[PDB]
Amino acid sequence: NFTPTPGESYNKNSPINIAAQNVYTYVRHMNSGHANYEQADLMMYLLAMD
Amino acid sequence: NFTPTPGESYNKNSPINIAAQNVYTYVRHMNSGHANYEQADLMMYLLAMD
Structure with missing residues (x-):
């Protein structure tokens, strides 16, 4: 059971x-x-798409 | 032992x-x-890259 992450930031x-x-x-x-x-809007879109 | 310079200005x-x-x-x-x-922003970027 996993949580998708963008890495630590x-x-x-x-x-x-x-x-x-x-x-x-x-x-x-x-x-x-x-x-x-x-x-940042593009990368947040790109994580929501994930 | 040197300091990189953009020349006198x-x-x-x-x-x-x-x-x-x-x-x-x-x-x-x-x-x-x-x-x-x-x-000037582009040239300061271009010196920071150096």
């Missing part, structure tokens, strides 16, 4: 936040336009 | 600021969208 130097930065600059630099969401 | 006519202008108009004119950072 205490600050922006966490691997989930560095991954949020990496995936947000991948997605934002592939989509023409001004986004309305930040990197 | 007293105003915007400095070579680090002219280089900031040059690299910022290279990066901004290759990326579709409205940036949120200025030229």
Whole structure:
């Protein structure tokens, strides 16, 4: 019986936040336009999808 | 035992600021969208990466 986790996180130097930065600059630099969401909104969406 | 430096800088006519202008108009004119950072933010990022 398990709980899905993003890993431990205490600050922006966490691997989930560095991954949020990496995936947000991948997605934002592939989509023409001004986004309305930040990197943390995209990673929280990406965990809710999990 | 050395200290890495951007060169001497007293105003915007400095070579680090002219280089900031040059690299910022290279990066901004290759990326579709409205940036949120200025030229000085990009050059300070580019020195922190060094």
